[PDB]
């Protein structure tokens, strides 16, 4: 159960998101909803226990905490990268 | 003893006969030349001549064989090379 919870709580596939954010994101209202939820997910992953102890087995989940933390950090960076592209492009198109 | 096949270019039926024939030869004979002779003769009878067999604990070989008539395997620590040529 807990092995699945570590995969279900924070998706580890994390398919690419650049297309989605560049097409339907970064208006004032919609973005605040998306980015606050992202910051919250950051707070959450910071609480992923480094290990789970049961009656017999001890599993080390510290490597998991590291990766899921980086994954949240990555989304914010991607969002920053995307914003700096849309703004640059639209003026050039309309200048054309 | 335990049969372990390392190389084979041979049908499944002939592979099994190779092991079975070598197994009987190893059980029946102590001397390598006689073990090899048993294995070779059995193949000449069932799958036609011309077969060749080398059995031993320490050797290397470089040979030419007929397509679909080559196997190299162990029974325990004893290596058996069984192939047709001619």
């Amino acid at each position: 159960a807990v092995l699945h919870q570590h995969k279900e709580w924070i998706v580890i596939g994390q398919v690419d998101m650049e297309a989605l954010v560049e097409k339907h994101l970064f208006t004032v209202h919609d973005w605040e909803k998306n980015f606050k939820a992202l910051k919250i997910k950051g707070k959450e992953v910071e609480r992923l226990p480094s290990a789970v102890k049961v009656d017999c087995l001890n599993i080390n989940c510290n490597p998991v905490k590291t990766v899921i933390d980086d994954l949240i950090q990555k989304x914010x960076x991607x969002x920053x990268x995307x914003x700096x592209x849309x703004x640059x492009x639209x003026x050039x198109x309309x200048x054309x | 003893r335990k049969a372990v096949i390392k190389n084979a270019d041979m049908s499944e039926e002939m592979q099994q006969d190779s092991v079975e024939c070598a197994t009987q030869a190893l059980e029946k004979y102590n001397i390598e030349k006689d073990i090899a002779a048993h294995i070779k003769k059995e193949f000449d009878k069932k799958y036609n001549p011309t077969w060749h067999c080398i059995v031993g604990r320490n050797f290397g070989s470089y040979v030419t064989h007929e397509t679909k008539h080559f196997i190299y395997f162990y029974l325990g620590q004893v290596a058996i090379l069984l192939f047709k040529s001619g």
Partner: protein, 310 residues
């Protein structure tokens, strides 16, 4: 928002069928029946066989050739009429019945003592797997319908599906063991024994195979029921005529051919064989037994009070 919905949708959508979800198999057999030797060789191990079994666990690994996906297969086994439901009921749950199959191994040493043995073991396991399909309160029973409708229409490939002579909603393959002793039975007994094996194959819709070195079907068919681990069905011809080897492809074993219901059972059953102190009270000790008594009670009572829900 939509970013997490998409991330969730893909990790959920995919992940059932690197390698697909593995199956596992349970081995019904008798104690010291030679089954351990066959299992350990099938898994490509060199380990000596253990006679006894107390819900043993083992596994194996296979590759494919383009990579090593780490194809893991889990195995469970238990032999003899020992703690049957207490142990069989533990590794088998309805939620994983789809991935669970049975194999039956018959020790040819004592066919007489074997028939009441395997019957009791088969009854215990059959009853359990039959119940778990809905014992869990599985309201979404679509899977339950699929499992029974698939299994009970795979054996009667050509033969009219008149009736389910014995509803058995789980795959089974039947194999013997130590057939080296079979040749030493009376010819009449070998025939009746062969009929008995074929009879059971029909009721359960389970193929039958011999045990030898050149008989590679033994390993394969186990792989087949074990999630194609060692190939595919590779259907061969039945050997009802020769009666020297034993082999049945499930679906061709019509009673009219293999026996040539109750009446056929009665015939082979009756013909082959119908006759089928820890207290330490007279002893005395004072300090040894008193202290053991006290310690025995104190520990056991504490473990009961733990009120485990197990």
């Amino acid at each position: 928002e939509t970013l997490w919905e998409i991330a969730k949708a893909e990790v959920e959508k995919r992940g059932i069928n690197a390698e697909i979800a593995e199956k596992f198999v349970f081995f019904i057999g008798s104690k010291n029946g030679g089954k351990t030797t066959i299992i350990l060789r099938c898994l490509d191990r060199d380990e000596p066989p253990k006679p006894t079994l107390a819900l043993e666990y083992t596994y194996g690994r296979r590759a494919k050739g383009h990579n090593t996906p780490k194809d893991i297969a889990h195995f469970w086994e238990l032999g003899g009429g020992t703690s049957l439901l207490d142990l069989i009921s533990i590794p088998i749950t309805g939620d994983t019945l789809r991935t669970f199959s049975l194999v039956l191994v018959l020790d040819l040493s004592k066919p007489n003592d074997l028939w009441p043995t395997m019957e009791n073991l088969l009854q215990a396991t059959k009853s359990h797997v039959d119940k778990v399909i809905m014992k869990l309160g599985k309201t979404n029973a679509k899977a339950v319908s699929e499992m029974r409708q698939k299994i009970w229409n795979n054996m009667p490939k050509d033969h009219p599906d008149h009736e389910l002579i014995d509803p058995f909603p789980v795959p089974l393959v039947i194999i013997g063991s130590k057939y080296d002793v079979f040749q030493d039975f009376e010819s009449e007994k070998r025939k009746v024994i062969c009929k008995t094996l074929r009879f059971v194959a029909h009721y359960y819709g389970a193929s039958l195979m011999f045990t030898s070195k050149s008989e590679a079907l033994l390993l394969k068919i186990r792989g087949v029921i074990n999630q194609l681990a060692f190939g595919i069905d590779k259907s061969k011809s039945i050997c009802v005529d020769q009666n020297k080897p034993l082999f049945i492809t499930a679906g061709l074993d019509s009673f009219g051919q293999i026996g040539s219901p109750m009446e056929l059972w009665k015939k082979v059953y009756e013909k082959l064989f119908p006759p089928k102190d820890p207290a330490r009270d007279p002893q005395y000790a004072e300090n040894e037994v008193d202290e053991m008594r006290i310690q025995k009670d104190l520990e056991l009572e504490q473990y009961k009070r733990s009120s485990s829900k197990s």
